Design a protein around this ligand. Structure first.
Ligand SMILES: CC(=O)N[C@H]1[C@H]([C@H](O)[C@H](O)CO)O[C@@](O)(C(=O)O)C[C@@H]1O
Ligand SMILES: [Ca+2]
Ligand SMILES: [Ca+2]
Ligand SMILES: [Ca+2]
Ligand SMILES: [Ca+2]
Ligand SMILES: [Ca+2]
Ligand SMILES: [Cl-]
Ligand SMILES: [Cl-]
Ligand SMILES: [Cl-]
Ligand SMILES: [Cl-]
Ligand SMILES: [Cl-]
Ligand code: NA
Lengths: 264, 281, 56, 138, 264, 27, 56
C-alpha cells in the first residue's frame, strides 16, 4: 500500500499531501536539530518558538512558461515576512533554522518538462557591473518571497550605480560555474511525466553554530527548467510553480528591539 | 582500503531491474557493470590515496608576488618602494583558489614558504652588500608601517621572519586562525544590516566575503640601508593547506575570475567549444 | 616519542618524531581513506534498493 | 581602560563583560536607574522603551552602593576582533532614569556615578599583536 | 544579611533590584504555572514563547503630584505592544499569562505619601453616560501602556455618544464599591517612609483555562494615593511612578494571521 | 584548564541579590 | 633524557631533549595555566559572598 509517490508532511498546524512524489531528499543525509550545549556559542537562554514558527508558509506562486529561464530565492530571506517566524527572526540578533522545502508543480499526462530544484549553501551570485566587484545592494540581494529570476543573457550596466543587482545568468548558475554541475548540491527533479513535487529537508548549514539571519542567507533555492515546458495544444500555456517552506528546529538568541531593514 | 573489485557474474532473466532508476529522487545512478553485463572476477588492489583532501591540497602554491627595493629614495613615491604591505589572501592568483572553491567551508593549518629574488637595476653604480629581509605579519589592528625604517618594524609582538638573501627559502606554519568554526570560501551576506531611514550610504556598499574577511597584512622591507647600486626584489608567497577538512562541495569555477568575488566578465563566459554535430566522436 | 608507520609502497616502515610544541607545525596528516559518497549520491529519506523499482 | 589596553595586544576576544556602577551622590539621594545592553542588528536605542527590550537591570540606589550590569557573550562568531569592525560589532549599552533621582532640601541636586569595566571568567583573548597605543620617532 | 527589604527578580534577559521593598505578594497564595493536560481545552499544540516574552517590560512613567487622584491599567492590554509578548498575543486567538508586577516610586526621608497598589480580577468599570448602561468603547476600555487616571468628580455626558468611556471615580473604585475595601484584592502599599516599591506575582485568573486576550482583560492594576504626596520645601513637587511588568508562563493557542484591533 | 563554562539557569525572585555590591571595599 | 609532552592542538605529542648544561639555554617554559585573580579583584580581609549584601 505504502509508496514512494505518496507522502504526508505535518509541521505545526499545517499539512502537505502529495500523490506523485519521488522520495524525499535529506540534504547531506542530515536531519535538522537543535544546537547542543557542546557546540553552543551565545550564552543567553534561547527562544525556541516551535509550532508558532516551524510550520509551512506558502510563497506567492510563479508561472512556468516555455520561455522561463528559472527562479531563485534565498533563505531565511524568503520567509522574513512570514508570520511568527519573521517576528522571531527580526526581534533577535541571532537565529538558526533548518527547513522542509516543498516545491509543487502539476500538469497532465500530455504536458512535458523538467525542473531542477537545488538547495545551495552560501549561494553567492555575480553582480551586474564590470566597473566594480561584489557590488550588490542589500535590497536587491534580499527580495523576500518574490525571489528573482534567471536570464539567458548577461548585460552588465553602463554605470556602476545601475548594476547593483545579481547577474543571474542561467547556464553559469548566476555565479561562474556550469549549471550542469549543480547536481553536486542537494536536489530533486520535477519531471512532469513522473512527479508533481519535490521535497528537500535541510539542516542548518554554516561555519558557525548560529548567525545573523538579517545579514546572512544560509541557503539558496534554485529552480531551473532543464527541459522546457511543452504542451502541444498550446505552446504558450503556463503552469504554476508553488513553493512552500517550513522552518524547523528554530532557535534564536540576543533579544532586543525589532530589526527593520532598509527598503530602498 | 582499495577501490572496488569486480565480482564474477553471469547473466540474468529476472524481475530484478538494477538498470532502471528514477533520478527525480535526487539520487544519482547507482548501477555498476556486474548489474548490466557478464563480468569476470578482477581483484582491485588500487587505492584512492592521491585524491584524499590532504593529497589534493598537499602542495605549496604561489599566491602572490610582492616587490620591494633598496635605494636612496628622495621622493614620496620612491620612499614607498622601500617597503611593501599586502593584505593576506589567496585571490591574487587562480590555481589554489579554484581548488579550495570546490568547497564551501574548510579548516586547515597553513604552511607558508617564500622565494626571494633580486636583480641589479643598473651597472654604472657599483655593487651592493648581501641583503637581509624582514617579513612581518601584522594582525588586524596592529600599526602598519609608513616608512621602511619606522618604529613598527621593532615587531615586539607581531611575528617577523628575518631572511638572509641566498639562504634556503624561509618557512613557517600558521594554525587554523578563523574566528568561526571553519573558514568560509563563500558568504552569502553582508557585514551589517542597513536599517529603515538611516542616513548611512547604501549606494557604494559591497556584498559577500569581501565585507567580512580580514587575515591581516604582510609587510616586507630590506633591512639594509641603501647602496650606490639600486637593488630590486621580488617576494613570491606560497601557501600549502595542511591537516585539511572541507565541507559542502561545489561545482568548480568554469569561467575566468575578474576579482575577489564570484563575478564574471562579459567577453569570457563561453567556456565550451561548439561541436560540429551531436554525433561527433 | 617516535612513531613508526607503514610507507606508501614503491616499485617498508618509516619513523617520525615531532620537534615542535604546536600541532600546526606537524607534517601532513596520515592518509585518511574515509568516504561516504551516499551523502551526495543518494541523500534520500527512504532507502532505495537498486534491484527494486525506484518508484513503486 | 585596563581591559582595553590588554585587548590591544591581541587580535581576538571572547566572553562576557562586566560593567559596575558606583553611585556617589549623598546618602539622602534616592533613585532608580535602568542599565541596558542591546545585542546588535537593530536601531540603536535612544529611548528607555527601546532600551528595556534588551538585556537590562533596574538599579535601586541604596545602602549597597554599586550595581553590576552584564553584557553576556552574545555573538555570531566565536571570537570578535579587537578593532572597529561591522562583522564583529558587539551592540549598544545605554542608561536611563527608571524613576528619577530624588533629594530633600539642603542636598546637592547634581551628582555623579563612576562606571567600571572588567572581564568575566568566561573571557579569553588570542593572537598576540603589537598595540597602536605606543610609538616613537625614528 | 538577607532582608525583607532587598530583592532581585530575574526573568529572561531582565533583572530588577530593590533595596527598600516590603516583602512581595503572591496573589491568592498561588504562583503562576502552565496549563495542565487535565484542565486543558484547545487541543492544538500551544506556543510557549518563554524568554522572548516572559520578561520585564517598563511602561511610560506617570507623575505623582499632591493633586493626583490615581492611575489604572488593564492586563494583558497594557503589554499588547510590548516586544514579542505583543506579537504572540496578536498572532493567536487564545492566550494565558501570569505576571510579576513591580511598581517603583522613590522619594526621600523628608517626603511623605502612600500609594495603594491593587491587582483586581475582572476589573469592570462604570461608563460615563446615564442614557445607557455598560456603554464603553473598545478603544477607551483598552488604552494600552498609557492606562488611565481616576477623578474625584463624576460628570456623565449630556449625550450618550460622548460618554463611552469609564467614569473612573476614585472613592467608588470606578465601579460602585468603596475604595477603602479594595484591600480584599491582592495588594501592597508604597508608603514613602517605609518602602519605594511594590511587587505582586499574579497567577492567571479566569473562569476558563485560556481566553481571548484581545477581547478580555483578566486583571486591573490600580494605584491610588491613599495619603497625598507632601513635601514641605515644594508642595507642587512631582515624583515618578514607574510600572514594570513581566508576563510569566505564557501559553498561546489558535495560530493564524495577526489581529490588528481598531484604533478609533 | 579552560575558561569558564556557562551553567543552565533560569530566573529568580529572591532575597539573594548578586547584582548589588559595594566597590568601596576594594573588591 | 627525552621528554615527551602534549602539543597545542591545531586545525599529538612532541619530543624535547636539552642540549646545554645551563637551564637558561632551554626553550620556553611549558604552559602554566595557574591563576588567582582574587588577589587583585577581591583582596578583602573578610569573605564577601556574592548573593549576600556587600555591607551588612
Ligand atoms: C631595469 C633596467 O632596465 N635596467 C637597465 C639600466 C637602466 O635602464 C638605466 O641604468 C637607468 O637609467 O640600464 C642598463 O643599461 C645598465 O645600467 O647597465 C641595463 C639595465 O638592465
Ligand atoms: Ca551480471
Ligand atoms: Ca632598506
Ligand atoms: Ca531500480
Ligand atoms: Ca517554546
Ligand atoms: Ca551582593
Ligand atoms: Cl517577503
Ligand atoms: Cl628595527
Ligand atoms: Cl645597513
Ligand atoms: Cl567537433
Ligand atoms: Cl500600548
Ligand atoms: Na579491492
Amino acid at each position: 500500500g505504502y509508496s514512494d509517490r505518496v507522502r504526508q508532511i505535518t509541521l505545526g498546524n499545517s499539512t502537505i499531501t502529495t500523490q506523485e512524489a519521488a522520495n524525499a531528499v535529506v540534504a547531506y543525509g542530515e536531519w535538522p536539530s537543535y544546537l547542543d550545549d557542546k557546540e553552543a556559542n551565545p550564552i543567553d537562554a534561547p527562544t525556541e518558538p516551535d509550532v508558532s514558527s516551524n510550520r509551512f508558509y506558502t510563497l506567492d506562486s510563479v508561472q512556468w512558461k516555455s520561455t522561463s529561464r528559472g527562479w531563485w530565492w534565498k533563505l531565511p530571506d524568503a520567509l522574513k515576512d512570514m508570520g511568527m517566524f519573521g517576528q522571531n527572526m527580526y526581534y533577535h540578533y541571532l537565529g538558526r533554522s533548518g527547513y522542509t522545502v516543498h516545491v509543487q508543480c502539476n500538469a497532465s499526462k500530455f504536458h512535458q518538462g523538467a525542473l531542477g530544484v537545488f538547495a545551495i549553501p552560501e549561494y553567492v551570485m555575480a553582480c551586474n557591473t564590470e566597473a566594480k566587484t561584489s557590488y550588490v545592494s542589500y535590497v536587491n540581494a534580499n527580495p523576500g518571497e518574490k525571489g528573482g529570476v534567471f536570464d539567458n543573457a548577461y548585460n552588465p550596466s553602463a554605470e556602476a550605480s545601475e548594476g547593483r543587482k545579481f547577474a543571474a545568468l542561467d547556464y553559469l548558475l548566476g555565479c561562474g560555474v556550469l549549471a550542469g554541475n549543480a547536481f553536486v548540491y542537494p536536489h530533486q527533479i520535477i519531471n512532469l511525466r513522473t512527479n508533481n513535487s519535490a521535497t528537500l529537508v535541510l539542516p542548518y548549514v554554516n561555519s558557525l553554530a548560529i548567525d545573523c539571519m538579517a545579514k546572512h542567507n544560509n541557503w539558496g533555492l534554485v529552480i531551473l527548467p532543464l527541459c522546457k515546458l511543452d504542451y502541444a495544444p498550446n505552446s504558450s500555456t503556463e503552469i504554476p510553480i508553488t513553493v512552500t517552506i517550513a522552518p524547523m528546529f528554530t532557535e534564536f538568541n540576543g533579544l532586543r528591539n525589532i530589526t527593520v531593514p532598509a527598503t530602498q | 582500503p582499495t577501490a572496488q573489485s569486480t565480482p564474477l557474474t553471469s547473466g540474468v532473466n529476472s524481475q530484478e531491474v538494477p538498470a532502471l532508476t528514477a533520478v527525480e529522487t535526487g539520487a544519482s545512478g547507482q548501477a555498476v557493470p556486474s548489474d548490466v553485463i557478464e563480468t569476470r572476477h578482477v581483484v582491485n588492489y588500487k587505492t584512492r590515496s592521491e585524491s584524499t583532501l590532504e593529497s589534493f591540497f598537499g602542495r605549496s602554491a604561489c599566491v602572490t608576488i610582492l616587490e620591494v627595493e633598496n635605494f636612496n629614495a628622495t621622493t614620496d613615491a620612491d620612499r614607498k618602494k622601500q617597503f611593501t604591505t599586502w593584505a593576506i589572501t589567496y585571490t591574487d592568483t587562480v590555481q589554489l583558489r579554484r581548488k579550495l572553491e570546490f568547497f564551501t567551508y574548510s579548516r586547515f593549518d597553513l604552511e607558508m614558504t617564500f622565494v626571494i629574488t633580486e636583480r641589479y637595476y643598473a651597472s654604472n653604480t657599483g655593487h651592493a652588500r648581501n641583503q637581509v629581509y624582514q617579513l612581518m605579519y601584522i594582525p588586524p589592528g596592529a600599526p602598519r608601517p609608513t616608512a621602511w625604517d619606522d618604529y613598527t618594524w621593532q615587531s615586539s609582538s607581531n611575528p617577523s621572519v628575518f631572511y638572509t638573501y641566498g639562504s634556503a627559502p624561509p618557512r613557517m606554519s600558521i594554525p587554523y586562525v578563523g574566528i568561526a568554526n571553519a573558514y568560509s570560501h563563500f558568504y552569502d551576506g553582508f557585514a551589517r544590516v542597513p536599517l529603515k531611514d538611516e542616513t548611512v550610504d547604501s549606494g557604494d556598499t559591497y556584498y559577500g566575503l569581501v565585507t567580512i574577511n580580514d587575515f591581516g597584512t604582510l609587510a616586507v622591507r630590506v633591512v639594509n640601508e641603501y647602496n650606490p647600486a639600486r637593488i630590486t626584489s621580488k617576494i613570491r608567497v606560497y601557501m600549502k593547506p595542511k591537516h585539511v577538512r572541507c565541507w559542502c562541495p561545489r561545482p568548480p569555477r568554469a569561467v575566468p575570475y575578474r576579482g575577489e568575488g564570484v563575478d564574471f566578465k562579459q567577453d569570457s563566459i563561453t567556456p565550451l567549444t561548439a561541436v560540429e554535430n551531436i554525433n561527433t566522436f | 616519542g617516535a612513531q613508526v608507520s607503514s610507507q606508501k609502497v614503491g616499485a617498508v616502515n618509516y619513523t617520525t618524531i615531532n620537534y615542535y610544541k604546536d600541532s600546526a607545525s606537524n607534517a601532513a596528516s596520515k592518509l585518511d581513506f574515509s568516504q561516504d559518497p551516499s551523502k551526495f549520491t543518494e541523500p534520500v529519506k527512504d532507502i532505495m534498493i537498486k534491484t527494486a523499482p525506484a518508484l513503486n | 581602560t585596563m581591559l582595553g589596553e590588554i585587548l590591544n595586544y591581541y587580535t581576538h576576544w571572547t566572553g562576557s563583560l562586566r560593567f559596575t556602577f558606583l553611585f556617589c551622590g549623598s546618602m539622602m539621594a534616592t533613585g532608580k536607574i535602568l542599565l541596558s545592553y542591546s545585542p546588535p542588528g537593530a536601531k540603536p536605542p535612544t529611548t528607555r522603551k527601546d532600551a528595556m527590550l534588551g538585556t537590562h537591570i533596574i538599579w535601586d540606589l541604596g545602602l549597597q552602593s554599586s550595581c553590576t550590569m552584564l553584557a553576556p557573550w552574545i555573538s555570531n562568531t566565536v571570537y570578535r576582533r579587537c578593532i572597529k569592525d561591522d562583522f564583529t560589532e558587539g551592540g549598544y549599552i545605554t542608561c536611563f532614569y527608571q524613576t528619577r533621582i530624588v533629594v530633600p532640601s539642603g542636598t546637592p541636586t547634581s551628582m555623579f556615578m563612576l562606571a567600571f569595566v572588567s572581564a568575566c571568567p568566561d573571557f579569553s583573548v588570542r593572537l598576540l599583536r603589537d598595540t597602536n597605543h605606543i610609538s616613537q620617532r625614528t
